[PDB]
Amino acid sequence: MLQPKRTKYRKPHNVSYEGKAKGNSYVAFGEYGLVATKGNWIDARAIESARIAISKCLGKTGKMWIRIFPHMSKTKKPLEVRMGSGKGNPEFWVAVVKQGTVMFEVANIPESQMIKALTRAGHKLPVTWKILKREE
Template sequence: MKKFPNNTKFKRPHKIKIIKGNKGIFLSRFSVGVRLKASRYLSYEQLETARRVITRLVKPKELKNKKNLTILKSTQQKFSRQTRRPRAKQKKFLYIRSNLCLPLTKKPLQVRMGKGKGSIDKWVFAANKSRVIFEMTRQRFKLRKVHRLLSVSRVKMPTKLKIIYHRLHTRRETNFVSKYI
């Protein structure tokens, strides 16, 4: 995700009013998503921290015992010498549906009124209520794990969020408790 767009129509446009609408309220690619409960300006830092939390929980934890780790690495090297196969690319499991397209300006401290608009302070995404921000796939994980990952990322966001599911995919899951839906 980029911090700011490559080119814009205006240097410092007016603020976009966040109004109700139906744009982006349904899941587009994957089966589980996170939806906003209130309209909000979302900055790059907020979206990036939520993404980092999810990816950190997905990565496997390293062994604490170094002796076991060296044994494990040596066996991995042994097997890698035997089979020289190209490694398959991992498919993406997280999709961020936001576009930082609105610059917010700010004047420096102790500057009098007038003399034009201030310089760009940060780029934000004007997200309206019930907009889907993150989507996750269920191909790599079970539905409970996806629910846990998204609920941990909810803490990092500035507004309340709701986890939504695609109804076709939740019917197929056999070990999923109905209290999560």
């Protein structure tokens, strides 16, 4: 789904996400936030699914910001072929989730509806969802 319109390199290593939280692990603009539990790979398809689900349950006045992006691309070898003969080929773009980072923030919506929307979104993404209130 989401994708930069120009990338210098085509076949980079995917990630080594093991460690602690990095980057956005707290709410910046939104009043409620989704925080994961373990680092994995997520495809832009699931991210878009979660976002559209939120927007569908989102009010016309509420606003949301995404704190992640499919920065890297997925690379798998084609089907039923032997091992070797160079690397694979690029595929759909993939975002990496670290340990306990925050990836979506929402604001301007009744708090119960906020929790409902976050719970709705959390079942699309492989990581384990957790809710956080605005911690200024």
